[PDB]
Amino acid sequence: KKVTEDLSKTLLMYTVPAVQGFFRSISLSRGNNLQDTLRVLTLWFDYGHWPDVNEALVEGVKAIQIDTWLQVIPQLIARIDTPRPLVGRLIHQLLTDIGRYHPQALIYPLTVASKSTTTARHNAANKILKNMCEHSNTLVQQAMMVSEELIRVAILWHEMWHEGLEEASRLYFGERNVKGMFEVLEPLHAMMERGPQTLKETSFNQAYGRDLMEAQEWCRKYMKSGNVKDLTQAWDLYYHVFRRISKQLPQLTSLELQYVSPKLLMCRDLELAVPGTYDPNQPIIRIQSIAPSLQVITSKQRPRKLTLMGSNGHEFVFLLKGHEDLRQDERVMQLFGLVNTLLANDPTSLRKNLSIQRYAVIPLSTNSGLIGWVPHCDTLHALIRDYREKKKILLNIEHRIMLRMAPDYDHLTLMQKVEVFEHAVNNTAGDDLAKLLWLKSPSSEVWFDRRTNYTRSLAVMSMVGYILGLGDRHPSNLMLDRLSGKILHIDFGDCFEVAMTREKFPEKIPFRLTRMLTNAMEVTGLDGNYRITCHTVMEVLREHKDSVMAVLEAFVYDPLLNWRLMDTNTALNKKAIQIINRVRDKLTGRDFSHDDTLDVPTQVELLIKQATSHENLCQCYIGWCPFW
Amino acid sequence: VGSDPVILATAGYDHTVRFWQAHSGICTRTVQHQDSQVNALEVTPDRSMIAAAGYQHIRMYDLNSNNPNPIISYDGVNKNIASVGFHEDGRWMYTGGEDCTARIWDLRSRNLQCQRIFQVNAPINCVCLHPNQAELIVGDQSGAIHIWDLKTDHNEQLIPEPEVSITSAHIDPDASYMAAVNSTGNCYVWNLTGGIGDEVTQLIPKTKIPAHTRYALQCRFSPDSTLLATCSADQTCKIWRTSNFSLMTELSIKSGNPGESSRGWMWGCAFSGDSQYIVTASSDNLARLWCVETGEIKREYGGHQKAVVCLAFNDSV
Amino acid sequence: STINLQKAWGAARRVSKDDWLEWLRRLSLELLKDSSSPSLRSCWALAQAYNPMARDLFNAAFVSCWSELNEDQQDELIRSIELALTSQDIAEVTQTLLNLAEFMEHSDKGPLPLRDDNGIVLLGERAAKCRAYAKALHYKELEFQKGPTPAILESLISINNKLQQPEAAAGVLEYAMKHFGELEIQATWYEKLHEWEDPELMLGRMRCLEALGEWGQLHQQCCEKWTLVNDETQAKMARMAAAAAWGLGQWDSME
């Protein structure tokens, strides 16, 4: 170890003025300092358990403004423990500096900190909660108490135990018995019997529960017996109550909030600022009251529409959902703070108003949280349907022209797939979108402005999408603002190149550009306004790599994001570094070929051609609307 | 059926294999592929038998029996089998198919498994005849002209125009010239050059052919080797003098009106008589029989339920 | 029945701005009084008492009578209306009828005909000369749908500058190199473009040379060309020639 240690401590002599000039620059500036904030916290989490690294860090930690750490509350609640001895021990205290000055910011993250499955986090949480309780006038006790109502209602027990039951038949079958009946079905009924048989309206929740119970008896008999009669009894009884549930999940819509939970609705005018919307630079806007009934969106996931009165008279609208922890999304929206700040530095970027539309993300479990309900927005998918349906054009004509030319489409050769795709495309107009945007808009003078803002906001996320690797761009995963014409984006489940990896219909695309969008842009096509907006953004990125690469490297290497990445893709640190290596190919023009440095114009031209291959397009799945 | 000295063999996208006594103007028998899209059809030049190939499958049948079922079957290349031929004596089948593993298969005895394998990084996009029957011409999704010895992997892997999958190739019947075809719309012709050492062929460049706007599909010689045809997604078959591989005459279905462009993406050509006739896989509902050099349309056959995928032919022993 | 259309058919003898504005208002009053809607038939009283809100009700009143015209009554009224624009460019009624046409374009009546061809060019010209550059741009986009010409591009490009969009004008030139090929007409127009950008040979360069300020070569050019030429060509270049002399400190030459 001595060779790498001597190197690491001669490196630490370099780290000393690195850290010092970082801290004094972090004193001298705001915003951009976050690159430095990340890097010092990084080298600390990397190597801080040596006392000689602790020397460089601790004096600067103890001689820099609190506001520094308000930049990293989520990035620092991520690994709230950071378990290595003097590292975690000092970070516990450092988080209780925010847990002295600014509890209204920290308290949602401290709610998150409560309910780790593994021990480590839960312990740092209980320490830091009760360190903060006195420093914060027992605000913690009010806020955790309130949040505990919301956490329980959040994936309201009924839809969960229904879905677990429907899943359980699709688990026990064949010979893998435990996965369905044993594991789901008794814990399910136990978690009706405590939970919604008490902290929801007992009897009517028990309206399903009382037939789920008689199937549960036969299930409990089978669990221990192994008598194959108990199995078929348990299943047939479950099929009967499942069939009752099967008719009612389709037609619940709006739900009285105390019947959603009798403690919910009833809290008022709190010691809490509105859910992570607020910040301590402003006078408080406080949770005052709640919408009387919360509303299941008519979708496969069944999220709840909500709104909260703030003490300032505003209403703040949220969508309550969960099948993954929103932190991953939060960190994607956090990076957009930086990219917006880059475009705000350059005079021509600034003059042309360029930015990404970030939106509010508030995680509350491994599954769930609140998402900000954006106003004024419709999916790109819905609008095409509206236009076609209102005109009484046959909705999905293009797939039908393909099948009528050849029903064999999906197993044709390369060039035959292309030929039939070209034929169905050439037999169909490709500009419904251009028409509906004009029709919808009031008058030409507004419409021209809208077309411009549409074009530019599309161009911006053409570049950041391509840098990130982002895919799954079917038009039900795109959204449009009906006042400005700005585009908006709504899923990031697979950010990196792995969209190209998907085995059946690989998303063989750098970013989505397509005939209805291009035909909705100017009659000139993309050269001029679009192409030049692409150049300016890529120049600004080609330049400020130290900022963007720091945020990327920090996020992408992260030992806890590595479990999100084992859910996304795939130590993984190597694949993470390979992604950063490929980003550094995109830096130069080595992305097209590993030998080459290319100018921005040449890089963009090759990128456009990659985004217009007929072959790639008719290797998206037909449900991706590659005809549009 | 099989006794006729001139037989037309075909499929539509409907993939049913349609066999015409060529003089007749009727599909005299039909073999009902409705499992998998046809990817090649391969009647023996001896007029006796056919290997019929499609997605995941090849099967072996006679020409003289009415609507036959598989006498031998071939399976496991669970991909598009874009080209099929033989060890020319009829001992083995050869297949270019879009698994990473092209194959030699038994026609000496009943076997479903391949007699041998050729393995490549990128899956296999085309094949052609090679006269020694100690190598095979192979082409693929790496764009590499894998002329390949049948056991050693002594191989050519040449790429004349950069990177792209080579869509087809063919040899001179007298094996002095070889033409290689690409998705970029082009063909490149290289002089066949010989080595007894190792077990592998050599190529030297001859002619550069930017033949079409649209993607170049297939080429074939007249039986006298005097002409080489080349044909495309572009709706026309251009005929070259073998001497310098430049234009004699052209037979075209380039549409009378652009209201119906792709009257057909003609999927290549074959010949009949002593270079009297040229035939095309015309990608219209017609399989199309024409005269060479005169360039003129003689008989056309509409029996396919969907438009033509492939043309296979006999006017030979 | 037809008194409505007769009050537009006075278009044979409306001459002054007030004649056509009086025609528009008294027409509106007859459209209201014989409208398909009982509501509007009362609103006719207010419209008489107070014209500014009649400007509004007119658009509805128009649909309310225009649905009750068959092809003859349509053609009859169409002519009196296309004659309102055709007679004169009068900005008031021009902008008003442009909004009325645009209102029809959003309507499911379709666009009104005006001298065939959905009025596209008449509307375009009228809009352009009314400084309403976005509406003019919309009609020029619409002509480009009915097939391109070099004259369309050399119209369109000025509209993009009249609306302050340099990158859009750059797009049209880029289009004109790839759609139209190296079309030798536009390939000449690289020296008809306002920027230097790599007597039309003499002054149709000196404009560019004194914009750039290639002061040495510009001084030689101005000295040479001014001493050579003898017409309004001397007068039109004398800016660049005094400017060159100034740039060179030649106070004697400058006069």
Residue numbers in the entry:
A (entry chain B): 1867 to 2436, 2492 to 2549
B (entry chain E): 8 to 324
C (entry chain B): 1261 to 1458, 1474 to 1530
Q: What do the authors say?
A:
The mammalian/mechanistic target of rapamycin complex 1 (mTORC1) is a large (~1 MDa) multiprotein complex consisting of two copies of three subunits: the evolutionary conserved Serine/Threonine protein kinase mTOR (a member of the phosphoinositide-3-kinase-related kinases superfamily of protein kinases, PIKKs), RAPTOR and mLST8. mTORC1 senses and integrates inputs originating from nutrients, growth factor signaling pathways, oxidative stress, and cellular energy levels. Two endogenous negative regulators of mTORC1 activity have been identified to date: DEPTOR (DEP-domain containing mTOR-interacting protein), which also inhibits mTORC2, and PRAS40 (proline-rich Akt substrate of 40 kDa). DEPTOR is a 46 kDa protein that consists of three distinct and highly conserved regions (from N- to C-terminus): two tandem DEP domains (a DEPt), an unstructured linker of ~100 residues (residues 228–323, which we have named long-linker) and a C-terminal PDZ domain. Our structural and functional analysis of reconstituted mTORC1 inhibition by DEPTOR revealed a unique bipartite binding mechanism, involving an interaction of the DEPTOR PDZ with the FAT domain of mTOR and the DEPTOR long-linker interaction with the FRB.
A similar reduction in DEPTOR IC50 was observed for the cancer-associated mTOR mutant A1459P. The cancer-associated mutant A1459P is in the middle of a helix fα12 at the major intra-FAT hinge, and our cryo-EM structure of the A1459P mutant bound to DEPTOR (global resolution 4.7 Å) shows this helix becomes disordered (residues 1457–1470). This disorder likely increases plasticity of the intra-FAT hinge, thereby improving DEPTOR binding. The structure of mutant mTORC1 bound to DEPTOR reveals a widening of the cleft between the mTOR N-heat and the PDZ-bound FAT domain, relative to this cleft in the structure of DEPTOR bound to wild-type mTORC1. This cleft widening might enable easier access for DEPTOR PDZ to bind to the FAT domain. Consistent with this proposal, we observe fast on/off kinetics for PDZ binding to the mTORC1 mutant A1459P with a Kd of 0.6 µM determined by SPR. For the wild-type mTORC1, the Kd is increased ten-fold (Kd = 7 µM), and we observe slow on/off kinetics, which suggests that there is a rate-limiting conformational change within wild-type mTOR to facilitate binding of PDZ. Structurally, the interaction of DEPTOR PDZ with the FAT domain does not seem to be significantly altered between mutant and wild-type mTORC1. Despite tight binding of DEPTOR PDZ to the A1459P mutant, there is no inhibition of the mutant by the isolated PDZ domain (without the long linker), even at saturating concentrations. This underlines the need for a bipartite interaction for effective mTORC1 inhibition by DEPTOR.
